[PDB]
Amino acid sequence: REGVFVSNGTHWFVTQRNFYEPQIITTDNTFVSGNCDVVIGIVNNTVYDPLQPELDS
Amino acid sequence: LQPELDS
Amino acid sequence: ALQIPFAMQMAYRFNGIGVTQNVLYENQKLIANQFNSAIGKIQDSLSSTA
Ligand SMILES: *[C@@H]1O[C@H](CO)[C@@H](O)[C@H](O)[C@H]1NC(C)=O
Numbered sequence A: 001r002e003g004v005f006v007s008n009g010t011h012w013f014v015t016q017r018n019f020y021e022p023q024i025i026t027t028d029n030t031f032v033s034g035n036c037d038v039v040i041g042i043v044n045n046t047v048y049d050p051l052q053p054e055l056d057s
Numbered sequence B: 001l002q003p004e005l006d007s
Numbered sequence C: 001a002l003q004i005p006f007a008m009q010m011a012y013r014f015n016g017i018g019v020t021q022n023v024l025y026e027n028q029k030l031i032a033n034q035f036n037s038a039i040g041k042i043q044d045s046l047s048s049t050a
């Protein structure tokens, strides 16, 4: 949404681009647009859902 | 949220 | 100088003019071709007259 995706090789995070501060990737940190075919150089991993704890209510 | 609150 | 991939530098330059950055990545080959064609026309433009 604003920031950059980065990884310590094992895990994927998003950060603000002018100071390293890792955030867990979530559907409020990010926005959807279309499908994995068109983006050159995309990667997989999970995106976590902030509603999931109350999906488990 | 409303389709998720269908749970 | 902090290295960054050139497609991501353009994504953050689009994000600087009120265009959501997915508009770049969904069009990257077309945007690269528009730039490559446009910079080609500069050589002919400069060649045409002093
Ligand atoms: C990045 O660079 C190397 C060498 O050009 C290439 O093998 C690799 O596929 C490239 N990846 C992307 C996402 O362009």
Ligand SMILES: *[C@@H]1O[C@H](CO)[C@@H](O)[C@H](O)[C@H]1NC(C)=O
Residues within 6 Å of the ligand: A042, A043, A044
């Ligand atoms: C992501 O995973 C799918 C299978 O779920 C696979 O087909 C695809 O090639 C993977 N993409 C990348 C960029 O690794």
